[PDB]
Amino acid sequence: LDSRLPAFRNLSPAARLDHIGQLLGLSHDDVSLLANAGALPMDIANGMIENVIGTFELPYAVASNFQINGRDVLVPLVVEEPSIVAAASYMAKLARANGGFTTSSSAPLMHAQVQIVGIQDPLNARLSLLRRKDEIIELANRKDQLLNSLGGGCRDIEVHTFADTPRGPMLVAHLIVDVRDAMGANTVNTMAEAVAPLMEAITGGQVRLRILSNLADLRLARAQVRITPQQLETAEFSGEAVIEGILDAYAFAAVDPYRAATHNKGIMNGIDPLIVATGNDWRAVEAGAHAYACRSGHYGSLTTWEKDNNGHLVGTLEMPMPVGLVGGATKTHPLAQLSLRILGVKTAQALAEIAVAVGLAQNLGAMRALATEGI
Amino acid sequence: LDSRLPAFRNLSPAARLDHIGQLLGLSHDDVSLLANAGALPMDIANGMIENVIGTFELPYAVASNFQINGRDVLVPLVVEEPSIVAAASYMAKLARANGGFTTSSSAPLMHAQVQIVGIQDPLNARLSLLRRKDEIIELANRKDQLLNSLGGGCRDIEVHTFADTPRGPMLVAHLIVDVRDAMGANTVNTMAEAVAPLMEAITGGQVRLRILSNLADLRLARAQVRITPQQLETAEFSGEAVIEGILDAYAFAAVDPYRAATHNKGIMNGIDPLIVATGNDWRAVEAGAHAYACRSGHYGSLTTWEKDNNGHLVGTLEMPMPVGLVGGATKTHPLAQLSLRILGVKTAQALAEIAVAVGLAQNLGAMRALAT
């Protein structure tokens, strides 16, 4: 319940573990998982990917001070780069004074693309599909009733066209599916294959690809922070000046893709480590994050920074966050299961909300640093 | 070296390791590193990042069959998702028949950004900097004399302007630096801080940010592959039909960002694992890759696929690839050092070339699967 971890940064790893062991009430066996190497059995490892000849380790750390919608959370991170954990913890600390981080998210919605070719009337074919939308949605939904009972399932169908391409005219259907606590790939791919035949019948063309889109722009996670001028006071700068500089730094990233790429990288320095820690696919999160950053036809910043009516620094982070609590290595990796135990997350979207708060804090630290450094 | 690794997929991890051990001539000490857990000492781990309480493992695998510019290479990969290693190995295998992968790259060039504000004459200030470009380049080239004798160093300066910004007018200088075998961040950031004072004097404004740009578009790595129709016909599909479908798949990715994001993700499924294996920063490679994919204003495909004059399928992958043989975890992690040993790479750009070939092969497999 209290994530402030005093002196944590100077406690030996063992001491730190013990600590985390107590405030979370961790089981004996659970502490053993991080106290001795080899938590990932070779036969579990050998079953995960192919041509396995061993394992590879990265430091497992915990960021402190985080507070999500008023409640404290400890955050596990796996990465090789220094400063990330510290910066995240420090900004999280400044965040608590003004209420911590405020988050929210959309329903866990993923797209499954169903590409159709060979139709001479793609535009007309599109209306035929929309005409029988509910018929397509039902076929897809009778392929996984458990999910429907669990509160998920196909909720809609969008169809897009690309009549003129070097390869001919293309029609692309998008199955919109609520995947509850899964990242969604197989739930979605599965349904895509189940409707493909019916779509062929309705359009008269042939389905080419049936697969999820990593541009999960219907599964957004949101986070907000607020920092006051008092908190940003350094030896040589006024907390106000620093706020103004951070604003100049954000503007620079909003206009220059060379700065934006770097700016967003910092955001991912905070997010990716939590993804690995929970056994999730970091390539999926990365692709969705960057593709979304250039949705305006201009590669820009995923976060926003402004000075509010009180003169306070307020930042935002809204982005796609496809992540899961079940699925793949999230279940088979003992440490992934433990990370979820440390986080206390009950839904995939809850984990997603924590991800953007950490990403927002990481961006903040990076900018505060650059903004406060002297010539 | 012969990277066939026959029956490798079915050998036990121990057998696979021994096999990699003979084949490479690794010492008992080196094999010991993958044969027992804990290759990464806590005190090494504890010094790597902050608030450490332990370690986290991921499978360490080796993709087979790769051939770079005629020479065989074994490729280490660390990832949690299945199919990646197998797909990469299988496409590499098809690639050998037609010469394997042909690669190349630019010099290891990185940008260091030096943002300048507080001036009412940015456009004019820019010419003043260009006027003394050489004076700036030399100052920077002293902050790191070792780099220069190794064959690297600041090689140029570009200056860009942003006249109207809701925050005022902005001038941004770009130091172009050859970082040899480093990824470059600290080499570049240091030089940026060394010139910032001189730039302030020349423009009259004040330096805000001084930091490298992760959009490493001056450090590109290139890979090519060729597959014949014979190699691509299944029990149910004709090779040419398959080549044609792959072509339809590429076209789809070139126009639809929803497909491109997925298409490019697959490319990174192949690249990121090699990055982690060598202790490199995977966020840096990811950011540069995707930012580069939408440079034209439209988020598209990093790879290209075409049918050449003899009807053969030919793909390419050109993209920024900032990686290092030295720097950070690449040196302190015993397994990172071992991965470089297995790779046999002598320069950072050589590792970069292997990265795009693996990324190209991964994209290929994904597409062959879906059109099949």
mmCIF file of C-alpha atoms in Angstrom, chain A:
data_model
loop_
_atom_site.group_PDB
_atom_site.id
_atom_site.type_symbol
_atom_site.label_atom_id
_atom_site.label_comp_id
_atom_site.label_asym_id
_atom_site.label_seq_id
_atom_site.Cartn_x
_atom_site.Cartn_y
_atom_site.Cartn_z
ATOM 1 C CA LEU A 1 0.000 0.000 0.000
ATOM 2 C CA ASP A 2 2.940 2.411 0.378
ATOM 3 C CA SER A 3 5.242 2.667 -2.618
ATOM 4 C CA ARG A 4 7.557 5.380 -1.246
ATOM 5 C CA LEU A 5 10.420 2.918 -0.660
ATOM 6 C CA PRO A 6 12.736 5.139 1.449
ATOM 7 C CA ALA A 7 16.479 4.410 1.058
ATOM 8 C CA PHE A 8 15.482 1.735 -1.459
ATOM 9 C CA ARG A 9 18.069 3.079 -3.890
ATOM 10 C CA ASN A 10 20.835 2.161 -1.445
ATOM 11 C CA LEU A 11 19.573 -1.100 -0.065
ATOM 12 C CA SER A 12 21.391 -4.159 -1.339
ATOM 13 C CA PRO A 13 19.389 -6.177 -3.875
ATOM 14 C CA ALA A 14 18.713 -8.776 -1.145
ATOM 15 C CA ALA A 15 17.590 -6.093 1.260
ATOM 16 C CA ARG A 16 15.466 -4.522 -1.500
ATOM 17 C CA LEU A 17 13.863 -7.911 -2.247
ATOM 18 C CA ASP A 18 13.107 -8.561 1.421
ATOM 19 C CA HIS A 19 11.537 -5.208 1.539
ATOM 20 C CA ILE A 20 9.357 -5.749 -1.452
ATOM 21 C CA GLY A 21 8.615 -9.118 0.163
ATOM 22 C CA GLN A 22 7.099 -7.569 3.269
ATOM 23 C CA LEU A 23 4.991 -4.556 2.096
ATOM 24 C CA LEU A 24 3.436 -6.896 -0.491
ATOM 25 C CA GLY A 25 3.197 -9.870 1.834
ATOM 26 C CA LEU A 26 5.001 -12.065 -0.676
ATOM 27 C CA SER A 27 5.186 -15.799 -0.239
ATOM 28 C CA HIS A 28 8.454 -17.460 0.683
ATOM 29 C CA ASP A 29 8.566 -19.378 -2.603
ATOM 30 C CA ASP A 30 7.945 -16.088 -4.402
ATOM 31 C CA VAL A 31 11.029 -14.410 -2.904
ATOM 32 C CA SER A 32 13.043 -17.475 -3.916
ATOM 33 C CA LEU A 33 12.282 -16.657 -7.542
ATOM 34 C CA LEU A 34 14.364 -13.493 -7.494
ATOM 35 C CA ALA A 35 16.894 -14.570 -4.849
ATOM 36 C CA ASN A 36 18.458 -17.364 -6.915
ATOM 37 C CA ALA A 37 19.222 -17.458 -10.634
ATOM 38 C CA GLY A 38 17.379 -19.764 -13.038
ATOM 39 C CA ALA A 39 13.731 -18.861 -12.387
ATOM 40 C CA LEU A 40 13.100 -19.759 -16.039
ATOM 41 C CA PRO A 41 13.462 -23.572 -16.408
ATOM 42 C CA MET A 42 15.207 -24.697 -19.581
ATOM 43 C CA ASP A 43 12.305 -26.938 -20.494
ATOM 44 C CA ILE A 44 10.035 -23.970 -20.054
ATOM 45 C CA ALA A 45 12.530 -21.880 -22.089
ATOM 46 C CA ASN A 46 13.028 -24.612 -24.700
ATOM 47 C CA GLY A 47 9.269 -24.631 -25.277
ATOM 48 C CA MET A 48 8.972 -20.879 -25.681
ATOM 49 C CA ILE A 49 11.066 -20.338 -28.835
ATOM 50 C CA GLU A 50 13.088 -22.478 -31.235
ATOM 51 C CA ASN A 51 16.780 -23.457 -31.407
ATOM 52 C CA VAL A 52 17.252 -22.659 -27.722
ATOM 53 C CA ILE A 53 20.713 -23.207 -26.251
ATOM 54 C CA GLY A 54 20.274 -21.311 -23.010
ATOM 55 C CA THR A 55 18.922 -18.210 -21.318
ATOM 56 C CA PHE A 56 19.920 -14.531 -21.220
ATOM 57 C CA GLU A 57 19.449 -12.296 -18.186
ATOM 58 C CA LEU A 58 18.688 -8.622 -17.689
ATOM 59 C CA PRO A 59 18.359 -6.769 -14.351
ATOM 60 C CA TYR A 60 14.932 -6.928 -12.704
ATOM 61 C CA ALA A 61 14.184 -3.728 -10.824
ATOM 62 C CA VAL A 62 11.260 -1.984 -9.155
ATOM 63 C CA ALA A 63 10.415 1.703 -9.611
ATOM 64 C CA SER A 64 9.142 3.477 -6.472
ATOM 65 C CA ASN A 65 6.532 6.101 -5.554
ATOM 66 C CA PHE A 66 4.057 5.459 -8.343
ATOM 67 C CA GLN A 67 0.480 6.298 -7.600
ATOM 68 C CA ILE A 68 -2.337 5.399 -9.976
ATOM 69 C CA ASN A 69 -5.706 7.054 -9.482
ATOM 70 C CA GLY A 70 -4.862 7.557 -5.832
ATOM 71 C CA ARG A 71 -3.520 4.098 -5.131
ATOM 72 C CA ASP A 72 0.098 3.185 -4.715
ATOM 73 C CA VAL A 73 1.741 0.634 -6.988
ATOM 74 C CA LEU A 74 5.190 -0.938 -7.195
ATOM 75 C CA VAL A 75 6.442 -1.306 -10.793
ATOM 76 C CA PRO A 76 8.784 -4.049 -12.031
ATOM 77 C CA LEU A 77 11.094 -3.185 -14.964
ATOM 78 C CA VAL A 78 13.623 -5.175 -16.984
ATOM 79 C CA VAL A 79 16.166 -3.179 -18.995
ATOM 80 C CA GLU A 80 19.944 -2.730 -19.484
ATOM 81 C CA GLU A 81 20.169 1.084 -19.614
ATOM 82 C CA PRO A 82 20.932 3.186 -16.506
ATOM 83 C CA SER A 83 18.964 6.212 -15.219
ATOM 84 C CA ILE A 84 15.580 4.924 -16.417
ATOM 85 C CA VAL A 85 14.439 3.410 -13.103
ATOM 86 C CA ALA A 86 15.763 6.352 -11.081
ATOM 87 C CA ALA A 87 14.214 9.012 -13.303
ATOM 88 C CA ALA A 88 10.882 7.242 -13.284
ATOM 89 C CA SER A 89 10.909 6.900 -9.504
ATOM 90 C CA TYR A 90 11.922 10.519 -8.928
ATOM 91 C CA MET A 91 9.245 11.992 -11.176
ATOM 92 C CA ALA A 92 6.676 9.606 -9.696
ATOM 93 C CA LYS A 93 7.693 11.087 -6.337
ATOM 94 C CA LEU A 94 7.108 14.658 -7.521
ATOM 95 C CA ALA A 95 3.773 13.441 -8.927
ATOM 96 C CA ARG A 96 2.453 12.191 -5.548
ATOM 97 C CA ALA A 97 2.439 15.719 -4.131
ATOM 98 C CA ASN A 98 -0.187 16.761 -6.650
ATOM 99 C CA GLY A 99 -2.253 13.587 -6.605
ATOM 100 C CA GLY A 100 0.000 11.158 -8.427
ATOM 101 C CA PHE A 101 -1.036 9.940 -11.864
ATOM 102 C CA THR A 102 -4.601 9.962 -13.163
ATOM 103 C CA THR A 103 -5.348 7.305 -15.780
ATOM 104 C CA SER A 104 -8.101 5.798 -17.909
ATOM 105 C CA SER A 105 -8.442 3.625 -21.010
ATOM 106 C CA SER A 106 -10.771 2.450 -23.706
ATOM 107 C CA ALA A 107 -12.185 -1.093 -23.856
ATOM 108 C CA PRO A 108 -9.613 -3.719 -24.939
ATOM 109 C CA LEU A 109 -10.469 -3.419 -28.667
ATOM 110 C CA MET A 110 -8.247 -4.930 -31.393
ATOM 111 C CA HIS A 111 -8.585 -5.025 -35.220
ATOM 112 C CA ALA A 112 -8.318 -8.130 -37.354
ATOM 113 C CA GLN A 113 -7.677 -7.259 -41.012
ATOM 114 C CA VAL A 114 -9.331 -9.278 -43.755
ATOM 115 C CA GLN A 115 -7.853 -8.261 -47.109
ATOM 116 C CA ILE A 116 -9.950 -9.081 -50.162
ATOM 117 C CA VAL A 117 -8.724 -8.999 -53.742
ATOM 118 C CA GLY A 118 -10.033 -9.862 -57.163
ATOM 119 C CA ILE A 119 -13.219 -7.789 -56.966
ATOM 120 C CA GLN A 120 -13.975 -5.414 -59.825
ATOM 121 C CA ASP A 121 -16.433 -3.552 -57.720
ATOM 122 C CA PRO A 122 -14.612 -3.172 -54.404
ATOM 123 C CA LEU A 123 -16.694 -0.106 -53.559
ATOM 124 C CA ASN A 124 -19.909 -2.039 -54.212
ATOM 125 C CA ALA A 125 -18.576 -5.149 -52.468
ATOM 126 C CA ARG A 126 -17.998 -2.962 -49.416
ATOM 127 C CA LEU A 127 -21.679 -2.106 -49.143
ATOM 128 C CA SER A 128 -22.635 -5.761 -49.456
ATOM 129 C CA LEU A 129 -20.447 -6.519 -46.441
ATOM 130 C CA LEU A 130 -21.852 -3.632 -44.423
ATOM 131 C CA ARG A 131 -25.303 -4.851 -45.438
ATOM 132 C CA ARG A 132 -24.644 -8.191 -43.750
ATOM 133 C CA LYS A 133 -22.459 -6.768 -40.973
ATOM 134 C CA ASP A 134 -24.502 -8.388 -38.194
ATOM 135 C CA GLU A 135 -24.393 -11.726 -39.933
ATOM 136 C CA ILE A 136 -20.607 -11.543 -40.139
ATOM 137 C CA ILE A 137 -20.335 -10.362 -36.529
ATOM 138 C CA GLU A 138 -22.376 -13.350 -35.325
ATOM 139 C CA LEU A 139 -20.454 -15.966 -37.207
ATOM 140 C CA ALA A 140 -17.270 -14.591 -35.676
ATOM 141 C CA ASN A 141 -18.907 -14.556 -32.231
ATOM 142 C CA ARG A 142 -20.072 -18.190 -32.315
ATOM 143 C CA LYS A 143 -16.455 -19.257 -32.485
ATOM 144 C CA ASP A 144 -15.638 -18.255 -28.898
ATOM 145 C CA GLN A 145 -18.611 -18.163 -26.521
ATOM 146 C CA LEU A 146 -16.461 -18.151 -23.339
ATOM 147 C CA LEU A 147 -15.097 -14.721 -24.272
ATOM 148 C CA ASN A 148 -18.615 -13.446 -24.925
ATOM 149 C CA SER A 149 -19.650 -14.618 -21.488
ATOM 150 C CA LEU A 150 -16.434 -13.115 -20.138
ATOM 151 C CA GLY A 151 -17.654 -9.834 -21.590
ATOM 152 C CA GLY A 152 -15.769 -9.653 -24.879
ATOM 153 C CA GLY A 153 -16.193 -10.614 -28.531
ATOM 154 C CA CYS A 154 -16.590 -9.038 -31.962
ATOM 155 C CA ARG A 155 -18.438 -5.737 -31.555
ATOM 156 C CA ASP A 156 -18.375 -4.308 -35.021
ATOM 157 C CA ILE A 157 -17.095 -4.278 -38.597
ATOM 158 C CA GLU A 158 -15.396 -1.470 -40.550
ATOM 159 C CA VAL A 159 -14.560 -1.825 -44.253
ATOM 160 C CA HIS A 160 -11.973 0.241 -46.113
ATOM 161 C CA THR A 161 -11.037 0.396 -49.780
ATOM 162 C CA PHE A 162 -7.986 1.064 -51.934
ATOM 163 C CA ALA A 163 -9.265 0.869 -55.509
ATOM 164 C CA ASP A 164 -6.048 2.086 -57.206
ATOM 165 C CA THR A 165 -2.725 0.306 -56.445
ATOM 166 C CA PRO A 166 -0.023 -1.164 -58.689
ATOM 167 C CA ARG A 167 -1.334 -4.551 -57.556
ATOM 168 C CA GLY A 168 -4.946 -3.823 -58.417
ATOM 169 C CA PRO A 169 -8.045 -2.803 -56.383
ATOM 170 C CA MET A 170 -8.200 -3.840 -52.685
ATOM 171 C CA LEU A 171 -10.989 -4.083 -50.110
ATOM 172 C CA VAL A 172 -10.044 -4.468 -46.435
ATOM 173 C CA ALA A 173 -12.466 -5.442 -43.670
ATOM 174 C CA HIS A 174 -11.706 -4.725 -40.027
ATOM 175 C CA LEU A 175 -13.226 -6.969 -37.389
ATOM 176 C CA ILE A 176 -13.394 -4.985 -34.120
ATOM 177 C CA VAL A 177 -12.911 -7.371 -31.208
ATOM 178 C CA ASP A 178 -12.943 -6.983 -27.422
ATOM 179 C CA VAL A 179 -10.275 -9.426 -26.186
ATOM 180 C CA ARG A 180 -10.699 -8.782 -22.441
ATOM 181 C CA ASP A 181 -7.372 -9.665 -20.817
ATOM 182 C CA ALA A 182 -5.461 -11.052 -23.775
ATOM 183 C CA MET A 183 -3.192 -9.001 -26.009
ATOM 184 C CA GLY A 184 -5.529 -10.326 -28.678
ATOM 185 C CA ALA A 185 -3.548 -11.681 -31.656
ATOM 186 C CA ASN A 186 -4.879 -15.250 -31.763
ATOM 187 C CA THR A 187 -8.405 -14.362 -30.580
ATOM 188 C CA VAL A 188 -8.524 -11.912 -33.439
ATOM 189 C CA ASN A 189 -6.699 -13.970 -36.088
ATOM 190 C CA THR A 190 -8.927 -16.909 -35.287
ATOM 191 C CA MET A 191 -12.150 -14.935 -35.937
ATOM 192 C CA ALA A 192 -10.635 -13.443 -39.091
ATOM 193 C CA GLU A 193 -10.177 -16.934 -40.512
ATOM 194 C CA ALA A 194 -13.700 -17.904 -39.488
ATOM 195 C CA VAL A 195 -15.351 -15.057 -41.452
ATOM 196 C CA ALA A 196 -13.005 -15.109 -44.451
ATOM 197 C CA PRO A 197 -15.090 -17.721 -46.247
ATOM 198 C CA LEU A 198 -18.361 -15.863 -45.723
ATOM 199 C CA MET A 199 -16.740 -12.618 -46.918
ATOM 200 C CA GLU A 200 -15.558 -14.375 -50.078
ATOM 201 C CA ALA A 201 -19.142 -15.446 -50.732
ATOM 202 C CA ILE A 202 -20.512 -11.960 -50.185
ATOM 203 C CA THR A 203 -17.949 -10.112 -52.347
ATOM 204 C CA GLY A 204 -17.044 -12.765 -54.873
ATOM 205 C CA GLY A 205 -13.361 -11.971 -54.452
ATOM 206 C CA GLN A 206 -10.735 -13.873 -52.462
ATOM 207 C CA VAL A 207 -9.305 -13.247 -49.030
ATOM 208 C CA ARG A 208 -5.559 -12.733 -49.040
ATOM 209 C CA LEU A 209 -4.338 -11.838 -45.558
ATOM 210 C CA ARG A 210 -6.271 -12.503 -42.323
ATOM 211 C CA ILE A 211 -4.390 -11.045 -39.452
ATOM 212 C CA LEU A 212 -4.425 -8.598 -36.617
ATOM 213 C CA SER A 213 -3.181 -5.092 -37.133
ATOM 214 C CA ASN A 214 -0.574 -3.900 -34.672
ATOM 215 C CA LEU A 215 -1.893 -0.359 -35.007
ATOM 216 C CA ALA A 216 -4.206 -0.750 -32.016
ATOM 217 C CA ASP A 217 -5.626 2.743 -32.115
ATOM 218 C CA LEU A 218 -8.956 1.552 -30.642
ATOM 219 C CA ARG A 219 -7.156 0.322 -27.478
ATOM 220 C CA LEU A 220 -5.818 3.541 -25.978
ATOM 221 C CA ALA A 221 -4.460 4.091 -22.443
ATOM 222 C CA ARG A 222 -4.308 7.568 -20.901
ATOM 223 C CA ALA A 223 -2.295 9.215 -18.152
ATOM 224 C CA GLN A 224 -2.016 12.724 -16.682
ATOM 225 C CA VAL A 225 0.504 14.399 -14.296
ATOM 226 C CA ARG A 226 0.874 17.843 -12.768
ATOM 227 C CA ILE A 227 4.054 19.402 -11.375
ATOM 228 C CA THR A 228 4.263 22.778 -9.632
ATOM 229 C CA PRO A 229 6.985 25.454 -10.100
ATOM 230 C CA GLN A 230 8.090 24.904 -6.499
ATOM 231 C CA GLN A 231 8.898 21.259 -7.263
ATOM 232 C CA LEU A 232 11.012 22.180 -10.329
ATOM 233 C CA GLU A 233 13.332 24.653 -8.572
ATOM 234 C CA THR A 234 16.998 23.812 -9.053
ATOM 235 C CA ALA A 235 20.164 25.548 -7.847
ATOM 236 C CA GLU A 236 20.433 27.913 -10.802
ATOM 237 C CA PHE A 237 16.922 27.971 -12.296
ATOM 238 C CA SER A 238 13.516 29.100 -11.100
ATOM 239 C CA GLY A 239 10.864 26.401 -11.053
ATOM 240 C CA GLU A 240 8.993 28.654 -13.493
ATOM 241 C CA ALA A 241 11.865 28.984 -15.983
ATOM 242 C CA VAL A 242 12.215 25.253 -15.928
ATOM 243 C CA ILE A 243 8.557 24.874 -16.692
ATOM 244 C CA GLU A 244 8.973 27.317 -19.585
ATOM 245 C CA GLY A 245 12.013 25.397 -20.885
ATOM 246 C CA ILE A 246 10.216 22.061 -20.794
ATOM 247 C CA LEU A 247 7.532 23.802 -22.849
ATOM 248 C CA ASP A 248 10.206 24.880 -25.380
ATOM 249 C CA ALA A 249 11.466 21.295 -25.368
ATOM 250 C CA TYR A 250 8.011 19.876 -26.093
ATOM 251 C CA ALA A 251 7.429 22.401 -28.886
ATOM 252 C CA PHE A 252 10.742 21.404 -30.451
ATOM 253 C CA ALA A 253 9.647 17.734 -30.451
ATOM 254 C CA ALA A 254 6.230 18.614 -31.872
ATOM 255 C CA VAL A 255 7.889 20.202 -34.921
ATOM 256 C CA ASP A 256 11.102 18.295 -35.533
ATOM 257 C CA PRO A 257 10.911 14.547 -36.287
ATOM 258 C CA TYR A 258 14.597 14.265 -35.340
ATOM 259 C CA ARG A 259 13.737 15.427 -31.853
ATOM 260 C CA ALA A 260 10.407 13.554 -31.741
ATOM 261 C CA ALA A 261 12.019 10.153 -32.456
ATOM 262 C CA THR A 262 14.376 10.799 -29.571
ATOM 263 C CA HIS A 263 11.576 12.259 -27.395
ATOM 264 C CA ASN A 264 9.344 9.206 -27.971
ATOM 265 C CA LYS A 265 12.284 6.812 -27.480
ATOM 266 C CA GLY A 266 12.493 8.135 -23.922
ATOM 267 C CA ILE A 267 8.826 7.366 -23.450
ATOM 268 C CA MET A 268 9.469 3.795 -24.576
ATOM 269 C CA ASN A 269 12.460 3.589 -22.204
ATOM 270 C CA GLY A 270 9.815 3.633 -19.485
ATOM 271 C CA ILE A 271 7.237 1.427 -21.137
ATOM 272 C CA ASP A 272 9.168 -1.429 -22.759
ATOM 273 C CA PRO A 273 10.815 -2.575 -19.496
ATOM 274 C CA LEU A 274 7.388 -3.087 -17.854
ATOM 275 C CA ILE A 275 6.278 -5.027 -20.955
ATOM 276 C CA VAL A 276 9.257 -7.399 -20.774
ATOM 277 C CA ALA A 277 8.790 -7.777 -17.032
ATOM 278 C CA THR A 278 5.247 -9.042 -17.600
ATOM 279 C CA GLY A 279 6.247 -11.328 -20.466
ATOM 280 C CA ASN A 280 4.448 -9.241 -23.080
ATOM 281 C CA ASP A 281 5.423 -8.547 -26.723
ATOM 282 C CA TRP A 282 7.447 -5.322 -26.753
ATOM 283 C CA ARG A 283 7.624 -5.192 -30.563
ATOM 284 C CA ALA A 284 3.815 -4.942 -30.662
ATOM 285 C CA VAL A 285 3.774 -2.016 -28.232
ATOM 286 C CA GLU A 286 6.638 -0.272 -30.061
ATOM 287 C CA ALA A 287 5.056 -0.556 -33.519
ATOM 288 C CA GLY A 288 1.683 0.665 -32.315
ATOM 289 C CA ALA A 289 3.314 3.516 -30.411
ATOM 290 C CA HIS A 290 5.374 4.915 -33.272
ATOM 291 C CA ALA A 291 2.825 4.313 -36.032
ATOM 292 C CA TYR A 292 0.342 6.241 -33.869
ATOM 293 C CA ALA A 293 2.853 9.091 -33.399
ATOM 294 C CA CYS A 294 2.758 9.835 -37.104
ATOM 295 C CA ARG A 295 -0.998 9.512 -37.565
ATOM 296 C CA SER A 296 -1.083 13.184 -38.321
ATOM 297 C CA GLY A 297 0.923 12.539 -41.474
ATOM 298 C CA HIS A 298 3.782 14.135 -39.434
ATOM 299 C CA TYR A 299 5.883 12.064 -37.012
ATOM 300 C CA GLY A 300 5.379 13.878 -33.719
ATOM 301 C CA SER A 301 5.279 13.589 -29.926
ATOM 302 C CA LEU A 302 3.076 11.015 -28.178
ATOM 303 C CA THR A 303 2.957 13.182 -25.047
ATOM 304 C CA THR A 304 1.800 16.777 -24.567
ATOM 305 C CA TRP A 305 2.986 19.419 -22.111
ATOM 306 C CA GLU A 306 1.258 22.659 -21.184
ATOM 307 C CA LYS A 307 1.152 25.273 -18.477
ATOM 308 C CA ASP A 308 -2.326 25.387 -16.974
ATOM 309 C CA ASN A 309 -4.316 28.332 -15.608
ATOM 310 C CA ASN A 310 -2.515 27.894 -12.275
ATOM 311 C CA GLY A 311 0.912 28.059 -13.908
ATOM 312 C CA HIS A 312 1.312 24.342 -13.180
ATOM 313 C CA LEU A 313 3.063 21.956 -15.559
ATOM 314 C CA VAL A 314 0.593 19.379 -16.912
ATOM 315 C CA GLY A 315 1.505 16.508 -19.194
ATOM 316 C CA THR A 316 -0.440 13.880 -21.070
ATOM 317 C CA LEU A 317 0.146 10.525 -22.626
ATOM 318 C CA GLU A 318 -2.523 8.884 -24.762
ATOM 319 C CA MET A 319 -1.483 5.970 -26.957
ATOM 320 C CA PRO A 320 -2.356 2.432 -28.046
ATOM 321 C CA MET A 321 -1.357 -0.129 -25.390
ATOM 322 C CA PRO A 322 -2.121 -3.745 -26.429
ATOM 323 C CA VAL A 323 -1.019 -5.865 -23.532
ATOM 324 C CA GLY A 324 -2.181 -9.076 -21.810
ATOM 325 C CA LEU A 325 -2.496 -10.753 -18.418
ATOM 326 C CA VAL A 326 -2.772 -14.213 -19.977
ATOM 327 C CA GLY A 327 -1.172 -15.400 -23.184
ATOM 328 C CA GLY A 328 2.245 -16.764 -24.121
ATOM 329 C CA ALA A 329 5.209 -15.988 -21.834
ATOM 330 C CA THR A 330 2.871 -13.919 -19.636
ATOM 331 C CA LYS A 331 1.650 -17.250 -18.208
ATOM 332 C CA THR A 332 4.596 -19.618 -18.714
ATOM 333 C CA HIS A 333 7.243 -17.307 -17.233
ATOM 334 C CA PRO A 334 7.343 -17.523 -13.401
ATOM 335 C CA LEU A 335 8.725 -13.986 -13.180
ATOM 336 C CA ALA A 336 6.049 -12.586 -15.492
ATOM 337 C CA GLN A 337 3.444 -14.110 -13.181
ATOM 338 C CA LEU A 338 5.298 -12.620 -10.228
ATOM 339 C CA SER A 339 5.502 -9.195 -11.874
ATOM 340 C CA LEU A 340 1.706 -9.271 -12.205
ATOM 341 C CA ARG A 341 1.607 -10.269 -8.546
ATOM 342 C CA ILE A 342 3.775 -7.255 -7.689
ATOM 343 C CA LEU A 343 1.661 -4.891 -9.783
ATOM 344 C CA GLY A 344 -1.636 -6.114 -8.356
ATOM 345 C CA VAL A 345 -3.345 -5.738 -11.711
ATOM 346 C CA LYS A 346 -6.723 -7.365 -12.181
ATOM 347 C CA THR A 347 -7.264 -6.534 -15.883
ATOM 348 C CA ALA A 348 -5.073 -6.047 -18.946
ATOM 349 C CA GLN A 349 -6.301 -2.447 -19.282
ATOM 350 C CA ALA A 350 -5.200 -1.753 -15.695
ATOM 351 C CA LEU A 351 -1.697 -2.856 -16.689
ATOM 352 C CA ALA A 352 -1.959 -0.650 -19.777
ATOM 353 C CA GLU A 353 -2.818 2.379 -17.645
ATOM 354 C CA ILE A 354 0.222 1.748 -15.490
ATOM 355 C CA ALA A 355 2.324 1.525 -18.656
ATOM 356 C CA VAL A 356 1.456 5.019 -19.908
ATOM 357 C CA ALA A 357 1.898 6.563 -16.455
ATOM 358 C CA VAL A 358 5.418 5.169 -16.362
ATOM 359 C CA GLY A 359 6.042 6.293 -19.901
ATOM 360 C CA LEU A 360 4.769 9.779 -19.058
ATOM 361 C CA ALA A 361 6.987 9.966 -15.988
ATOM 362 C CA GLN A 362 10.032 8.812 -17.967
ATOM 363 C CA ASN A 363 9.476 11.522 -20.621
ATOM 364 C CA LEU A 364 9.105 14.089 -17.836
ATOM 365 C CA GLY A 365 12.388 13.140 -16.198
ATOM 366 C CA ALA A 366 14.275 13.255 -19.500
ATOM 367 C CA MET A 367 12.999 16.738 -20.301
ATOM 368 C CA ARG A 368 13.492 18.034 -16.786
ATOM 369 C CA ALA A 369 17.097 16.878 -16.976
ATOM 370 C CA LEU A 370 17.882 18.461 -20.333
ATOM 371 C CA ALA A 371 15.936 21.557 -19.374
ATOM 372 C CA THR A 372 17.821 21.989 -16.091
ATOM 373 C CA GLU A 373 21.351 21.394 -17.377
ATOM 374 C CA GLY A 374 23.612 24.432 -17.661
ATOM 375 C CA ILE A 375 25.909 25.539 -20.472
#
